[PDB]
Design an enzyme around this catalytic site. Structure first.
Site, mmCIF file in Angstrom:
data_model
loop_
_atom_site.group_PDB
_atom_site.id
_atom_site.type_symbol
_atom_site.label_atom_id
_atom_site.label_comp_id
_atom_site.label_asym_id
_atom_site.label_seq_id
_atom_site.Cartn_x
_atom_site.Cartn_y
_atom_site.Cartn_z
ATOM 1 N N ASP A 141 -26.354 -2.820 -19.624
ATOM 2 C CA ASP A 141 -26.336 -3.774 -20.728
ATOM 3 C C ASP A 141 -25.105 -3.683 -21.215
ATOM 4 O O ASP A 141 -24.173 -2.838 -21.120
ATOM 5 C CB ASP A 141 -27.355 -3.077 -21.853
ATOM 6 C CG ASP A 141 -27.671 -3.817 -23.007
ATOM 7 O OD1 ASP A 141 -27.685 -4.872 -23.035
ATOM 8 O OD2 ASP A 141 -27.828 -3.184 -24.199
ATOM 9 N N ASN A 167 -27.891 -9.879 -23.553
ATOM 10 C CA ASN A 167 -28.253 -10.895 -24.486
ATOM 11 C C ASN A 167 -27.118 -11.539 -25.158
ATOM 12 O O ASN A 167 -26.703 -10.614 -26.053
ATOM 13 C CB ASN A 167 -29.446 -10.716 -25.251
ATOM 14 C CG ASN A 167 -30.798 -10.732 -24.778
ATOM 15 O OD1 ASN A 167 -30.835 -10.701 -23.524
ATOM 16 N ND2 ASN A 167 -31.600 -10.558 -25.444
ATOM 17 N N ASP A 185 13.851 0.238 -6.737
ATOM 18 C CA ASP A 185 14.727 0.471 -5.650
ATOM 19 C C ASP A 185 15.596 -0.676 -5.516
ATOM 20 O O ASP A 185 16.467 -1.062 -6.650
ATOM 21 C CB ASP A 185 13.843 0.322 -4.412
ATOM 22 C CG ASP A 185 14.723 0.741 -3.200
ATOM 23 O OD1 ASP A 185 14.932 1.825 -2.930
ATOM 24 O OD2 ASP A 185 14.808 -0.118 -2.292
ATOM 25 N N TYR A 205 21.569 6.858 6.410
ATOM 26 C CA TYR A 205 20.978 5.559 6.898
ATOM 27 C C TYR A 205 21.332 4.213 6.630
ATOM 28 O O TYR A 205 21.070 3.257 7.342
ATOM 29 C CB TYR A 205 19.318 5.638 6.517
ATOM 30 C CG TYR A 205 19.260 5.485 4.918
ATOM 31 C CD1 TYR A 205 18.960 4.213 4.453
ATOM 32 C CD2 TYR A 205 19.583 6.561 4.271
ATOM 33 C CE1 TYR A 205 19.035 4.174 3.035
ATOM 34 C CE2 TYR A 205 19.353 6.461 2.678
ATOM 35 C CZ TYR A 205 19.218 5.115 2.393
ATOM 36 O OH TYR A 205 19.150 5.120 0.832
ATOM 37 N N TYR A 254 21.288 -4.618 2.332
ATOM 38 C CA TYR A 254 22.062 -3.550 2.930
ATOM 39 C C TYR A 254 23.281 -3.890 3.481
ATOM 40 O O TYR A 254 24.162 -3.121 3.537
ATOM 41 C CB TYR A 254 21.374 -2.466 3.907
ATOM 42 C CG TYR A 254 20.291 -1.792 3.096
ATOM 43 C CD1 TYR A 254 20.650 -0.641 2.307
ATOM 44 C CD2 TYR A 254 18.983 -2.124 3.492
ATOM 45 C CE1 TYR A 254 19.629 0.051 1.591
ATOM 46 C CE2 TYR A 254 17.990 -1.196 2.901
ATOM 47 C CZ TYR A 254 18.205 -0.145 2.111
ATOM 48 O OH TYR A 254 17.196 0.740 1.546
ATOM 49 N N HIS A 293 9.953 8.641 -4.048
ATOM 50 C CA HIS A 293 10.634 7.427 -4.068
ATOM 51 C C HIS A 293 9.541 6.347 -4.409
ATOM 52 O O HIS A 293 10.044 5.316 -4.967
ATOM 53 C CB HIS A 293 11.221 7.128 -2.615
ATOM 54 C CG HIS A 293 12.101 5.748 -2.763
ATOM 55 N ND1 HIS A 293 12.917 5.189 -3.539
ATOM 56 C CD2 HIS A 293 11.522 4.629 -1.920
ATOM 57 C CE1 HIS A 293 13.048 4.005 -3.254
ATOM 58 N NE2 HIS A 293 12.133 3.594 -2.166
#
Ligand SMILES: O=C(O)CCCCCCNC(=O)NC1CCCCC1
Ligand SMILES: O=C(O)CCCCCCNC(=O)NC1CCCCC1
Ligand SMILES: [Mg+2]
Ligand SMILES: [Mg+2]
Lengths: 547, 547
Positions: A8, A123, A334, A382, A465, A523
């Site tokens: 309800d 209702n 990032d 990396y 990059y 990260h």
């Protein structure tokens, strides 16, 4: 055996029960007990209230009629009314005061999460008040959480009439025996019970949930803190703006209010904001979750230069231009975080407010070249590995599923080591072929990223990059500036590449800089701690970006 | 021989010339003449102002420096400053006071319309003031009107330096001999003249335009009232919301502010609002020009019922739901007009305001069936002709180009006759095979509609005319209601099918109804009188829909 839950609205998923105000207005105005309630039901089935509840008349047409009933109902108990009595006044206040009973909604959501077909049977009335938007918004939020929303004023059927119930049973494609009905009004329970369906007289949420839990055999009460609403990609509004010949950006759009542009990092998607998009929207913002150039449905041209920060930012400006937006709050994560910082440095006029997650603003060293700087940081190895076109592409693409399952992990789940990749020969050299399933992502979600990257791959993303020399030179032009527009930096404790410490001297270039910090967060911030993030950003937007 | 026009911003396309405020602040504050101007140029090339103009420092960094210069410049002429002197105060006021010199913009636009490559070459700053949004918006509007916008603070080149000019010549890919340079600052003209290019010292707009007109040999001054900005389909933001399985609506989105949903009629497109989309946006609204179900990039399912008003409206509600919008101002035309009226009658909570063009709100006759009613109106004959599936489809599709050239015509251009089509056997039975070119549409535009309809054809569109019995029944449920939310009806004098007279009794169901009327306007209102329409709607939105 139950398989359907029907709630309800007023008094079950919404409180204080509007109408439940009548009783208060009496004890408050010292009126004869029930007086306003008898007026609210003056005439029963043929009563103005029943017509209003069926959709025959709008709320604004009803108000005058209920007032008349508050003149004829008091005409009988001797009694007269205050000089400043107003039914609109009483109801406007009642409706806006009514709020979503969160605990009930949670129970509702849980049941849905475990197979149940939920639905709101209420209702209600066609609300044409000048404040109708209030009800609208509350309905906007609830609606999306239930398979069905059966409104009396829409079906012309209002309940204790058993017909609305048959309608319900039919809309649910379920038999009485497998339906639970929660309502704070006994009468409305009779017809439900009569068809042979479980009913719960709801007085206090906890007791009702207790009964509901028992009858369903599912933990509803004292349940853990749930994850914020995530959004289904196929229900989202998808937008496409061509910012340059054969370069169109794709974005997801939700909510209204100040435009808040979300910019994901590498190697993600607009989907990485799947947790804050509904929140920020619900918070009163027009969320524009982007597909940064190179990703998903956005254009991913092959050339490297197409991804230098300058070209990336210009395009974002054009994006605003094309969308007819003079400003937008830029929130990045990032690489996206990096992007917004420079948006604030080169296009302050377009940035209502800027906020970054994990990525700190660090001015370019006018002396040392980027390449050298990065070679001077083990954890940033990396990045050198991503330099040679093709190399990183091949490995990250060999097994997409593996790549994302290997990347998207919480602080205590790592299966890689960003330090010593040039040596290892690759990012996954000594990573499992079949990485376990992170606590942050479902198999389905990882698969979304997989299907996204099956379009443009990692060339475009990796190129972000490959413009350090260019970005460096560009950034050197901003060395005499200062971010003086509203800015908010949010650090992540457990992020071991974009460490919180790297942001310590930011106040020097961003004097009024506000901050935020999230513990045990890795990260992949948005995924890791969606609740805290939404909390932190919403609090910041409402204070430094709304005005 | 000229082929390029370059306009200065402050003082040429924008007035009053900011900086031109210095002189006023002096005569106002009774300060030594030029005092504030000498401070504004304190140091020349090495001056704080030149650094600010080159992008080295932001405006907020500059302000303090200019204040210092207003202390050292007054330190010399004996003189001191008022207790309440503020450079920010002077500039905030100056910048916001500056407005687009419309006559210049018009000259600019004209030249562009006749082959010229226009561009804005200005000495500006990176604006990070809390009021920066002001400049932003003004830049947002101008930008789209020029092929190029060369900002000094962006190129690091500020002018009277001849380098910025070489940059310009290069950005334009044009030689000096074919470039016109408008500027209110003589000095900035020297370098331009020296390279061998036409220069115009702009003092008063009209004189400058006079000189510009002469030198270009093109009517710029006293030119007719131009058409509002129309939008290029390929530069628009396109949105797609799946409202139901295999039913996604396409829309064009522009601007920010209250959401204003535009709903085209039959047989049109979102493109039919190509004139008000930029306006309403510029007026401060988030325009959502739809592709109503059945048209263009929106889904066009074959079934008739898929187009009954009830299903159409529910979908629009879902559209709002999916977009995270609790409300939207609904403005419809023709069939779209009809749609919004029922949106206000069945979903007031979602309609911030409703407005219709040509289409009046006329309650269903509970007694007479639609079919009969329409048979009782000569001009509504064709509607009977559209009933039989396939029939109308075949003719309207035989020659798309012909169909639209035959339909889209002003009051005094008609080539058809909506009365007696069942008899004639078709809509174009006695219409030219090669209809002339209407004054309202260019060959290119007609071709847009043609290419749009080459997707789904006229089945979906025609079906909007095949649910009268259903719409009738649905509408009968609303006979006891009244549109009490902000509503605006706009009639078209020369519309001979949706005649102004048909709206006369509308105040009965819409008491507070506001109106608008357009003379010499046919059925294709938006195309016919875009200027008046934009005027009428913008005025209505700002008064009854913004609040
Ligand atoms: O440090 C600098 O001098 C310049 C840095 C540009 C940094 C972008 C940083 N974000 C990522 O590298 N994310 C990686 C997190 C691990 C998984 C791959 C994406
Ligand atoms: O009158 C009634 O009872 C119901 C009317 C539904 C009317 C839709 C009206 N709009 C058009 O017909 N436009 C035509 C204008 C001429 C060219 C074709 C589209
Ligand atoms: Mg109730
Ligand atoms: Mg000037």
């Amino acid at each position: 055996t139950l398989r359907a839950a029907v709630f309800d609205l007023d008094g079950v998923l919404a409180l204080p029960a509007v109408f439940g105000v009548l009783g208060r207005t009496e004890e408050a105005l010292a009126l004869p007990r029930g007086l306003l309630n008898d007026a609210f039901q003056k005439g029963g089935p043929e009563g103005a209230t029943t017509r209003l509840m069926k959709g025959e008349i709008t709320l604004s047409q009803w108000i005058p009629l209920m007032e008349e009933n508050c003149r004829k109902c008091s005409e009988t108990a001797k009694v007269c009314l205050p000089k400043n009595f107003s039914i609109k006044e009483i109801f406007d206040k009642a409706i806006s005061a009514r709020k979503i009973n969160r605990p009930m909604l949670q129970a509702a959501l849980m049941l849905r999460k475990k197979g149940f077909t939920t639905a709101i049977l209420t209702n209600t009335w066609l609300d044409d008040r000048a404040e109708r938007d209030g009800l609208a918004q509350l309905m906007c939020e609830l609606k999306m959480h239930f398979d069905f929303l059966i409104e009396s004023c829409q079906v012309g059927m209002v309940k204790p009439e058993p017909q609305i119930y048959k309608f319900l049973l039919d809309t649910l494609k379920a038999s009485p025996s497998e339906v639970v009905f929660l309502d704070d009004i006994g009468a409305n329970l009779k017809p439900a019970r009569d068809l042979g369906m479980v009913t719960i007289l709801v007085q206090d949420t906890d007791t009702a949930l207790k009964e509901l839990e028992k009858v369903t055999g599912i933990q509803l009460l004292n349940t853990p803190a749930p994850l914020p609403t995530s959004c289904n990609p196929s229900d989202m509004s998808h937008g496409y703006v061509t910012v340059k010949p054969r370069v169109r950006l794709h974005f997801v759009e939700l909510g209204s209010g100040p435009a808040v542009c979300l910019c994901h990092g590498f190697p993600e998607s607009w989907y990485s904001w799947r947790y804050q998009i509904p929140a920020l929207a619900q918070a009163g913002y027009r969320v524009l979750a982007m597909d940064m150039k190179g990703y998903g449905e956005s254009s991913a041209p092959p050339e490297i230069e197409e991804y230098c920060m300058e070209v990336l930012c210009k395009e974002m400006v054009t994006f605003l231009d094309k969308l007819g937006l003079s400003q937008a709050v830029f929130i990045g994560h990032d690489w996206g975080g990096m992007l917004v910082w420079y948006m604030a440095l080169f296009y302050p006029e377009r940035v209502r407010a800027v906020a970054s997650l994990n990525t700190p603003f660090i001015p370019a060293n006018p002396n040392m070249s980027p390449l050298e700087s990065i070679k001077a940081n083990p954890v940033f190895d990396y990045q050198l590995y991503f330099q040679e076109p093709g190399v990183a592409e091949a490995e990250l693409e060999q097994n997409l599923s593996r790549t994302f399952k290997s990347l998207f992990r919480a602080s205590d789940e790592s299966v890689l080591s960003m330090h010593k990749v040039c040596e290892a020969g690759g990012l996954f050299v000594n990573s499992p072929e079949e990485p376990s399933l992170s606590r942050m992502v479902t198999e389905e979600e990882i698969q979304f990223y997989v299907q996204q990257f099956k379009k443009s791959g990692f060339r475009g993303p990796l190129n972000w990059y490959r413009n350090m020399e260019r970005n460096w030179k560009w950034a050197c032009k901003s060395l005499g500036r200062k971010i003086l527009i509203p800015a908010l930096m949010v650090t992540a404790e457990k992020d071991f590449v974009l460490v919180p410490q790297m942001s310590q001297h930011m106040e020097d270039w961003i004097p009024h800089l506000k901050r935020g910090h999230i513990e045990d967060c890795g990260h992949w911030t948005q995924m890791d701690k969606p609740t805290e993030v939404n909390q932190i950003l919403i609090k910041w937007l409402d204070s430094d970006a709304r005005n």
